[PDB]
Amino acid sequence: GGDFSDPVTSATLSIVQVFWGLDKKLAQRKHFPSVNWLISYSKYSTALESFYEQFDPDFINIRTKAREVLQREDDLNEIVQLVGKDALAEGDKITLETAKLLREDYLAQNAFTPYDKFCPFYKSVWMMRNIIHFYNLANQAVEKGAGMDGQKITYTLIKHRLGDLFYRLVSQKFEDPAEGEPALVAKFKKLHEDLTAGFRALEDETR
Amino acid sequence: VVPTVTMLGVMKSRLVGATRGHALLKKKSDALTVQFRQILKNIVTTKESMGEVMKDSSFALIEAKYVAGENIKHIVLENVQNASIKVRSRQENIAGVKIPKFEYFTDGETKNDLTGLARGGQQVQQCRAAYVKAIELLVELASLQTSFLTLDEAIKTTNRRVNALENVVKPRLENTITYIKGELDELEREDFFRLKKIQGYKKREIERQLASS
Amino acid sequence: TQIPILTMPNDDITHPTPDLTGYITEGQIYIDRQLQNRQIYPPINVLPSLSRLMKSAIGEGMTRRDHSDVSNQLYANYAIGKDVQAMKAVVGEEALSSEDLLYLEFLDKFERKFVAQGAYDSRNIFQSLDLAWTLLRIFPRELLHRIPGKTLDQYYSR
C-alpha cells in the first residue's frame, strides 16, 4: 500500500545508509525518477567531501543552496495551497522560480532518450551552478534595483526580457552527452556567461 | 502521523472542530454576502441621484448664466455659495467588517458659506445639493468595496476548509482506523490463536505419551 | 420498563458496549460533560437525546393533548437558539435581528430555568408542560410555526 511503516521497510531503513525513497505522486505525474527529494536522505554526503573538494569547491555549497531552495519551495507550496497565489513576496516568487526549473529540468530525467539515458557528473555540476547562478542573480536584483519596485517586482519583466536565457536554461538538459564532452561543457559555460552578462546588464540598465 | 487510539481520538476531534468552524464561516460568509447585495442594491438605487441632481445643477447653471453671463470663476471659482468642501470620516462595523462612514461639507460637518452669486441660492439648491447624493454614493461604494474584499477572503477560507482541510483529515482518520483495527486487532487474535495451538499440541503430546506407557 | 444506565468510556459512542446496546434498545439519553461544567445539575443533552418511540407516550387519553406540539417547538427553538448563539459569537451580535435576541433569551431561560431542575424538585408532567408554555409564550403566537392550530388559541393566552 505504499506506507513506509511496513516491517520490511522499517528494518531496512534502520540499517541502510543512503536511501532513495520514491513517491507515487511523481510517478503519477510521469516525473520518471520519482525520487521524493523531501523524504529521501543520504548519510554519505560527509565522506565524499574530499572527492567534492578535489572535483569542484562550488558544488558543496550550491548543493546546500539547492536543498534550501527545495525546502522553501515545499513550505511555499504548503502556504499557497490555502492562502492563494497572490500576496506572495517577489523574493518568494523568485524562489518558486528556478525551483520549478530545478524540478522539471534537473531532477527530471526521461531515462528512455539518447540524452537522458546517461548523464556525466560534471554536466550535472554545471547544471546546478547555472540554476544557482540564476537564483543568485535574481535575488541580487531583488536586493537592489534603484527602488523596491525596480528591484523585486521586476520578475514579471525578467520573464520577458530574459526569456531566451530562461528557455536555454530549461533546454540545456536536452543535449546528449554522446555529442562530445568538450562540446557540452563549452555549451554550458557559454550559456552561463550569456545569462550572467544579460542579467547583469539589465540590472545595470535603467537601475 | 503515528497511529494510536489517542491519535485516532485527536484526529476525530480535529475533524469535528473543523466541521463546526466551516459551518460558522459559511454562516458568516452568507451574512456578509447578504450585506454586500444590500449595499449593491443601494448603490444601484442611488446611481439615479447622480443623474437627477446633475440635471438640476445644469438647469441652475443655465439660469445663472442667463442672469449674470460668464461667472467670475478664477479666484473664487464662483458657481456656488455653499460647499466649503472638507471631508470627515467614520468607521462603522457590520458583521465584523469595518465599513467606513463619510461626511463632508454640504453633506455633514465642516461646511461654510459666504455671499454667493446672483443665482447663488439656486446654484446651492441644485449644484451644491448634489453634494449629499455624492457623499452617499461614495459611502456606498466604499462599503461595497470593503464588503467585497471581506467576502472574498471569507469565501477563500471556507472553500479551503471544505476542500483541503476536511478532505485531508478524513483520509488520515481512515488510515489510523485501518492501522489499529486492521493490523493490531488481527495480530492479537493470531498471537492468541497460535498460543492456543501450542497448548493443544502440548496436551495432545502429553496424552499420547501417557497412552504409550 | 428498563432504563439501563451505561458508562461510555472515553466519552465516545464508538466503544463496543454503547455501540452494541444502541441497536438492541430504542433511545439514547446522553449526559453531556459540558452541561455538567456549565453547572446545570441535570446535564442531559436534550437536543442530541431522543426516544425512538416517544410518540406512543404522547397522546390524548394519556398525558395532555399539546405534548407533541410543545416538544417539537422546544426542540426547534433550542436548535435555533444554539445556532443564533454561535452566529453571535462571530457576527458581533449588533447585526442580530429581534428574533435572534428572542431566541438567545429563550435559550438562556431554557438552560437556566427548565433543564436545571433541583435534585428534589419533583415536577408533575402537567406543571412541566406549564413551564414549557411559559417559555414558549415569549414568541408571538404567529411565530410558533411548528404548533398546529386550535392549540395556540387554547394555551397561548395563558
XYZ file of C-alpha atoms in Angstrom:
578
model
C 0.000 0.000 0.000
C 2.973 2.363 -0.179
C 3.093 3.007 3.570
C 6.672 3.112 4.851
C 5.633 1.637 8.211
C 5.942 -1.934 6.931
C 8.220 -4.200 8.995
C 10.484 -4.794 5.992
C 10.936 -1.105 5.202
C 11.410 -0.083 8.836
C 14.045 -2.751 9.453
C 15.811 -1.844 6.211
C 15.888 1.890 6.943
C 17.125 1.152 10.465
C 20.456 -0.011 8.989
C 20.710 1.261 5.394
C 22.884 4.351 4.981
C 21.716 6.001 1.758
C 18.009 5.836 0.999
C 16.361 6.763 -2.312
C 12.730 6.924 -1.290
C 10.164 7.241 -4.061
C 6.738 8.882 -4.183
C 3.738 7.538 -6.078
C 2.511 11.059 -6.858
C 5.547 11.827 -9.024
C 5.132 8.519 -10.851
C 1.512 9.507 -11.484
C 2.674 12.830 -12.960
C 5.101 10.950 -15.256
C 8.070 12.512 -13.472
C 10.102 9.278 -14.133
C 12.908 9.334 -11.492
C 10.085 9.607 -8.922
C 12.654 10.385 -6.206
C 10.884 12.369 -3.490
C 13.574 14.925 -2.651
C 11.820 15.867 0.604
C 11.929 12.485 2.362
C 14.977 10.769 0.841
C 18.325 11.154 2.573
C 21.967 10.183 2.137
C 24.227 9.794 5.159
C 27.263 9.516 2.860
C 27.473 13.222 1.973
C 30.077 13.622 4.727
C 32.595 11.093 3.405
C 32.551 12.387 -0.186
C 33.585 15.874 0.959
C 37.171 15.163 -0.109
C 36.040 13.981 -3.545
C 33.865 17.066 -3.986
C 36.703 19.359 -2.898
C 39.190 17.834 -5.325
C 36.487 17.954 -8.014
C 34.844 21.351 -7.516
C 34.701 23.684 -4.490
C 31.460 25.206 -5.811
C 29.383 22.022 -5.662
C 29.477 21.568 -1.878
C 27.797 24.973 -1.488
C 25.416 25.008 -4.452
C 24.115 21.659 -3.189
C 23.144 23.261 0.119
C 21.633 26.198 -1.763
C 19.538 23.831 -3.891
C 18.387 21.881 -0.832
C 17.368 25.124 0.877
C 15.519 26.168 -2.282
C 13.662 22.846 -2.304
C 12.648 23.173 1.350
C 11.486 26.750 0.771
C 9.511 25.604 -2.274
C 7.794 22.940 -0.177
C 6.896 25.487 2.508
C 5.654 27.979 -0.095
C 3.515 25.304 -1.751
C 2.035 24.429 1.640
C 1.227 28.100 2.256
C -0.218 28.780 -1.203
C -2.377 25.642 -1.071
C -4.687 27.693 1.177
C -3.652 31.371 1.021
C -3.595 31.796 -2.753
C -1.054 32.698 -5.413
C -1.431 36.415 -4.664
C 0.197 38.321 -1.783
C 3.463 36.433 -2.338
C 6.705 38.314 -1.791
C 8.656 38.803 -5.006
C 11.558 37.051 -3.300
C 9.263 34.098 -2.653
C 8.178 34.264 -6.294
C 11.843 34.182 -7.336
C 12.279 31.180 -5.033
C 9.405 29.284 -6.658
C 11.060 30.302 -9.906
C 14.159 28.210 -10.641
C 12.624 25.744 -8.216
C 10.192 24.850 -10.966
C 13.254 24.833 -13.233
C 15.174 22.520 -10.893
C 12.198 20.157 -10.702
C 11.410 19.994 -14.415
C 14.924 20.359 -15.867
C 17.459 18.969 -13.373
C 15.910 16.220 -11.248
C 13.553 15.103 -14.016
C 15.080 12.609 -16.443
C 13.349 10.692 -19.224
C 15.625 7.612 -18.898
C 14.479 6.380 -22.347
C 16.106 9.003 -24.575
C 19.521 9.458 -26.218
C 20.170 12.426 -23.917
C 18.843 11.258 -20.529
C 19.992 7.626 -20.692
C 23.353 8.691 -19.242
C 24.451 11.921 -17.593
C 28.076 12.679 -16.664
C 28.727 14.129 -13.238
C 30.258 17.480 -14.163
C 27.387 18.092 -16.574
C 25.093 17.927 -13.549
C 27.562 20.171 -11.719
C 27.305 22.804 -14.459
C 23.516 22.461 -14.453
C 23.406 23.102 -10.702
C 25.828 26.021 -10.977
C 23.705 27.586 -13.721
C 20.492 27.223 -11.714
C 22.075 28.620 -8.547
C 23.645 31.460 -10.557
C 20.207 32.346 -11.928
C 18.802 32.290 -8.392
C 21.633 34.448 -7.035
C 21.376 36.984 -9.867
C 17.610 37.254 -9.412
C 17.953 37.795 -5.664
C 20.764 40.299 -6.230
C 18.373 42.240 -8.456
C 15.730 41.891 -5.730
C 18.187 43.312 -3.188
C 18.888 46.487 -5.189
C 17.085 47.720 -8.292
C 17.084 51.508 -7.821
C 13.812 51.222 -5.912
C 11.741 48.440 -4.392
C 9.514 48.252 -7.475
C 12.571 48.143 -9.735
C 14.319 45.593 -7.511
C 11.962 42.684 -6.782
C 8.651 43.309 -8.577
C 10.566 43.159 -11.880
C 10.363 39.333 -12.009
C 7.489 39.578 -14.497
C 9.622 41.895 -16.637
C 12.539 39.460 -16.318
C 10.269 36.671 -17.569
C 10.093 38.523 -20.913
C 13.349 40.472 -21.287
C 15.309 37.400 -20.126
C 13.052 34.763 -21.685
C 15.629 33.463 -24.157
C 18.165 32.659 -21.439
C 15.450 31.048 -19.301
C 14.453 28.829 -22.223
C 18.095 27.930 -22.825
C 18.477 27.072 -19.130
C 15.493 24.735 -19.222
C 16.576 23.231 -22.563
C 20.243 22.645 -21.671
C 19.250 19.170 -20.431
C 18.175 18.073 -23.926
C 21.729 17.718 -25.268
C 23.045 14.154 -25.326
C 26.436 13.542 -23.671
C 27.371 11.415 -26.695
C 27.816 14.694 -28.615
C 31.300 15.100 -27.121
C 32.329 16.137 -23.622
C 34.123 19.395 -24.592
C 31.130 20.382 -26.724
C 28.660 20.100 -23.847
C 30.962 21.736 -21.291
C 31.579 24.623 -23.697
C 27.845 24.996 -24.341
C 27.162 25.084 -20.595
C 29.895 27.657 -19.970
C 28.672 29.817 -22.855
C 25.118 29.673 -21.513
C 26.323 30.723 -18.064
C 28.346 33.634 -19.443
C 25.499 34.808 -21.689
C 22.966 34.702 -18.851
C 25.368 36.471 -16.483
C 26.109 39.250 -18.969
C 22.472 39.719 -19.950
C 21.055 39.853 -16.441
C 23.907 41.999 -15.108
C 23.336 44.476 -17.941
C 19.575 44.511 -17.350
C 20.086 45.109 -13.624
C 22.587 47.836 -14.574
C 20.226 49.295 -17.205
C 17.528 51.748 -16.027
C 18.581 50.864 -12.452
C 1.205 10.544 11.692
C 1.810 7.658 14.095
C -1.376 5.581 14.525
C -2.738 5.129 18.048
C -6.047 5.187 19.898
C -5.206 8.607 21.337
C -4.171 9.743 17.856
C -7.480 8.473 16.460
C -9.381 10.414 19.112
C -7.371 13.563 18.416
C -7.991 13.253 14.675
C -11.721 12.740 15.237
C -11.846 15.801 17.497
C -9.953 17.854 14.915
C -12.379 16.768 12.191
C -15.379 17.689 14.350
C -13.888 21.079 15.169
C -13.094 21.688 11.508
C -16.686 20.883 10.541
C -18.028 23.259 13.193
C -15.664 26.030 12.126
C -16.591 25.501 8.486
C -20.276 25.854 9.340
C -19.605 29.037 11.318
C -17.514 30.509 8.497
C -20.217 29.625 5.963
C -22.791 31.444 8.091
C -20.522 34.490 8.364
C -19.882 34.475 4.610
C -23.614 34.232 3.897
C -24.305 37.207 6.165
C -21.526 39.225 4.523
C -22.872 38.313 1.079
C -26.361 39.456 2.094
C -24.923 42.763 3.309
C -22.917 43.146 0.088
C -26.029 42.503 -2.009
C -27.914 45.121 0.006
C -25.080 47.622 -0.483
C -25.003 46.923 -4.227
C -28.767 47.432 -4.465
C -28.455 50.708 -2.545
C -25.660 51.889 -4.855
C -27.727 50.986 -7.923
C -30.690 52.903 -6.488
C -28.591 55.977 -5.650
C -26.958 55.980 -9.097
C -30.065 57.768 -10.418
C -29.363 60.609 -7.977
C -26.153 61.299 -9.914
C -28.374 61.990 -12.929
C -31.261 63.833 -11.287
C -29.128 66.185 -9.186
C -26.807 66.662 -12.168
C -29.756 67.750 -14.322
C -30.916 70.124 -11.581
C -27.405 71.576 -11.270
C -27.234 72.015 -15.044
C -30.560 73.871 -15.042
C -29.360 76.129 -12.221
C -26.100 76.783 -14.083
C -28.028 77.747 -17.224
C -30.216 80.090 -15.172
C -27.149 81.685 -13.565
C -25.506 82.103 -16.974
C -28.657 83.749 -18.330
C -28.690 86.033 -15.283
C -25.066 87.189 -14.998
C -23.452 85.911 -18.202
C -19.992 84.486 -17.588
C -19.238 83.576 -13.983
C -16.341 85.194 -12.136
C -14.557 81.831 -11.768
C -10.747 82.038 -11.430
C -10.020 83.328 -7.925
C -13.190 82.078 -6.203
C -14.354 79.695 -8.990
C -17.839 81.231 -8.498
C -20.821 78.966 -9.374
C -21.686 78.292 -5.699
C -22.402 79.838 -2.305
C -22.183 76.708 -0.123
C -19.715 73.776 -0.325
C -16.568 74.795 1.549
C -15.531 71.221 0.840
C -13.951 69.408 3.794
C -14.498 65.699 4.431
C -14.699 63.802 7.726
C -14.573 60.019 8.062
C -16.092 57.496 10.461
C -15.751 53.720 10.791
C -18.868 51.597 11.275
C -18.865 47.839 11.827
C -21.259 45.425 10.113
C -20.743 41.659 10.518
C -17.185 42.315 11.684
C -16.307 44.440 8.634
C -15.106 47.990 9.340
C -17.405 49.761 6.886
C -16.355 53.427 6.601
C -18.768 56.324 7.024
C -18.271 59.594 5.150
C -19.406 63.131 5.970
C -18.331 66.405 4.381
C -19.356 69.984 3.674
C -22.965 70.385 2.480
C -23.332 66.705 3.433
C -22.386 66.847 7.104
C -19.926 68.862 9.168
C -17.091 71.196 8.101
C -19.401 73.339 5.950
C -19.309 77.107 5.477
C -20.767 79.702 3.129
C -20.340 83.379 2.272
C -22.339 85.667 -0.044
C -22.634 83.843 -3.369
C -23.508 84.723 -6.942
C -26.744 86.128 -8.379
C -28.379 82.711 -8.738
C -26.063 81.529 -5.962
C -29.101 80.476 -3.969
C -30.344 78.428 -6.915
C -26.822 77.129 -7.553
C -26.535 75.978 -3.937
C -30.018 74.450 -4.101
C -29.052 72.482 -7.232
C -25.269 72.288 -7.714
C -24.437 72.120 -4.002
C -27.481 69.917 -3.355
C -25.781 67.139 -5.335
C -23.118 67.055 -2.606
C -25.296 64.939 -0.306
C -26.007 62.475 -3.118
C -22.306 62.311 -3.996
C -21.358 61.680 -0.360
C -23.965 58.917 -0.091
C -22.702 57.344 -3.322
C -19.096 57.486 -2.102
C -20.018 55.908 1.241
C -21.968 53.171 -0.544
C -19.068 52.493 -2.921
C -16.550 52.274 -0.074
C -18.846 49.941 1.867
C -19.337 47.768 -1.220
C -15.586 47.547 -1.836
C -14.855 46.615 1.782
C -17.670 44.051 1.839
C -16.473 42.535 -1.442
C -12.925 42.164 -0.121
C -14.098 40.648 3.171
C -16.479 38.271 1.387
C -13.684 37.172 -0.948
C -11.379 36.440 1.991
C -14.079 34.561 3.910
C -15.102 32.557 0.838
C -11.483 31.609 0.171
C -11.072 30.425 3.763
C -14.347 28.475 3.686
C -13.538 26.823 0.355
C -10.064 25.895 1.592
C -11.509 24.357 4.759
C -14.153 22.412 2.825
C -11.804 21.153 0.114
C -8.344 20.867 1.657
C -8.532 20.552 5.441
C -11.506 18.216 5.917
C -10.562 16.016 2.961
C -7.034 15.904 4.359
C -8.180 14.867 7.830
C -10.760 12.232 6.883
C -8.281 10.001 4.965
C -5.973 10.366 7.962
C -8.746 9.139 10.258
C -9.465 6.216 7.926
C -5.779 5.265 7.760
C -5.473 5.451 11.549
C -8.560 3.264 11.969
C -7.203 0.743 9.460
C -3.743 0.631 11.050
C -5.146 -0.108 14.509
C -8.042 -2.451 13.760
C -6.756 -3.925 10.507
C -3.373 -4.853 11.976
C -3.219 -4.759 15.785
C -6.577 -6.446 16.369
C -5.834 -9.061 13.707
C -2.395 -9.745 15.189
C -3.780 -10.088 18.718
C -6.168 -12.832 17.632
C -3.423 -14.532 15.613
C -1.000 -14.433 18.545
C -3.610 -15.879 20.912
C -4.663 -18.440 18.309
C -1.062 -19.629 17.950
C -0.787 -19.795 21.741
C -3.939 -21.914 21.956
C -2.494 -24.146 19.244
C 0.679 -24.555 21.307
C -1.399 -25.509 24.347
C -3.407 -28.022 22.330
C -0.223 -29.549 20.940
C 1.216 -29.866 24.448
C -1.958 -31.543 25.715
C -2.019 -33.938 22.756
C 1.649 -34.826 23.258
C 1.078 -35.465 26.970
C -1.935 -37.669 26.226
C -0.039 -39.640 23.572
C 2.939 -40.133 25.893
C 0.629 -41.354 28.663
C -1.131 -43.747 26.274
C 2.188 -45.145 25.018
C 3.107 -46.129 28.593
C -39.728 -0.780 31.574
C -35.937 -0.582 31.623
C -33.753 2.490 31.962
C -30.301 0.856 31.988
C -27.517 3.266 32.900
C -24.438 2.595 30.782
C -21.000 4.177 31.069
C -19.424 5.020 27.720
C -15.624 5.002 28.139
C -13.510 7.809 26.666
C -16.692 9.913 26.318
C -17.437 8.450 22.883
C -20.086 6.116 21.477
C -17.681 4.071 19.324
C -16.905 1.927 22.381
C -18.153 -1.663 21.888
C -20.678 -1.648 24.733
C -22.579 1.571 23.828
C -22.387 0.881 20.090
C -23.647 -2.652 20.734
C -26.504 -1.628 23.023
C -27.567 1.077 20.571
C -29.108 -1.476 18.215
C -30.921 -3.522 20.867
C -32.605 -0.532 22.521
C -34.726 2.296 21.077
C -33.314 5.502 22.516
C -30.394 7.385 23.989
C -30.439 9.886 26.852
C -26.925 11.311 26.899
C -25.336 13.064 29.854
C -23.146 15.851 28.464
C -19.880 16.822 30.145
C -20.090 20.478 29.100
C -23.506 20.900 30.737
C -22.017 19.490 33.937
C -19.258 22.078 33.564
C -21.936 24.731 32.996
C -23.246 23.711 36.460
C -26.667 22.590 35.223
C -27.469 19.789 37.645
C -29.313 17.526 35.177
C -26.816 17.792 32.337
C -28.973 15.799 29.924
C -28.072 16.980 26.415
C -31.759 17.196 25.324
C -31.078 18.126 21.673
C -28.767 15.095 20.961
C -31.055 12.878 23.111
C -34.163 11.254 21.575
C -36.632 8.421 22.088
C -37.208 6.238 19.031
C -40.815 5.645 20.140
C -41.669 8.813 22.063
C -44.865 9.158 20.004
C -46.660 6.435 21.987
C -46.278 8.330 25.270
C -47.698 11.491 23.690
C -51.446 11.296 23.222
C -54.915 12.433 24.212
C -56.131 9.749 26.628
C -52.773 9.562 28.336
C -50.859 12.774 29.161
C -52.056 16.015 27.533
C -53.090 16.971 24.014
C -50.357 19.547 23.378
C -47.446 17.231 24.269
C -46.090 16.598 20.768
C -46.548 20.213 19.681
C -44.673 21.677 22.642
C -41.962 19.020 22.348
C -41.299 19.791 18.685
C -41.463 23.546 19.286
C -38.982 23.313 22.161
C -36.628 21.167 20.046
C -36.706 23.517 17.071
C -36.422 26.670 19.180
C -33.449 25.242 21.129
C -31.649 24.386 17.870
C -32.358 27.882 16.557
C -31.089 29.420 19.792
C -27.871 27.414 19.666
C -27.332 28.462 16.048
C -28.010 32.103 16.931
C -25.549 31.978 19.833
C -22.923 30.515 17.500
C -23.607 33.292 14.983
C -23.433 35.981 17.683
C -20.030 34.591 18.626
C -18.794 35.693 15.180
C -21.135 38.461 13.928
C -20.612 40.805 16.891
C -24.284 40.490 17.989
C -25.020 44.041 16.800
C -26.460 42.864 13.469
C -28.778 40.281 15.048
C -32.465 40.873 14.387
C -35.164 40.958 17.059
C -35.996 37.277 16.567
C -32.328 36.427 17.119
C -32.418 38.143 20.515
C -35.694 36.380 21.327
C -34.092 33.015 20.587
C -30.983 33.947 22.590
C -33.002 34.860 25.673
C -35.158 31.749 25.222
C -32.030 29.586 25.100
C -30.706 31.224 28.264
C -34.037 30.748 30.051
C -34.339 27.128 28.911
C -30.834 26.335 30.133
C -31.127 28.173 33.460
C -34.773 27.624 34.449
C -36.088 24.479 32.732
C -33.244 21.961 32.453
C -31.662 22.929 35.776
C -34.214 21.133 37.933
C -33.308 20.728 41.569
C -32.260 17.384 42.986
C -35.565 17.186 44.883
C -37.958 19.429 42.908
C -40.440 16.771 41.840
C -42.410 18.031 38.838
C -45.632 16.548 37.520
C -45.887 16.425 33.740
C -48.725 18.962 33.803
C -46.720 21.653 35.578
C -43.702 20.700 33.469
C -45.761 21.446 30.357
C -46.973 24.634 32.042
C -43.324 25.669 32.391
C -42.795 24.756 28.738
C -45.703 27.016 27.778
C -44.272 29.763 29.985
C -41.051 29.608 27.982
C -42.923 29.296 24.675
C -45.311 32.235 25.100
C -42.435 34.698 24.699
C -42.568 34.292 20.929
C -45.547 35.778 19.060
C -48.451 33.402 18.511
C -47.766 33.556 14.772
C -44.057 32.819 15.281
C -44.582 29.292 16.677
C -44.804 27.757 13.218
C -44.431 24.153 14.402
C -47.518 24.402 16.643
C -50.763 23.292 14.948
C -53.954 25.298 15.068
C -56.568 25.087 17.840
C -53.700 24.609 20.337
C -52.196 28.101 20.296
C -55.664 29.570 20.801
C -56.141 27.169 23.717
C -52.880 27.757 25.589
C -51.028 30.793 24.202
C -53.470 33.040 26.083
C -52.051 31.688 29.380
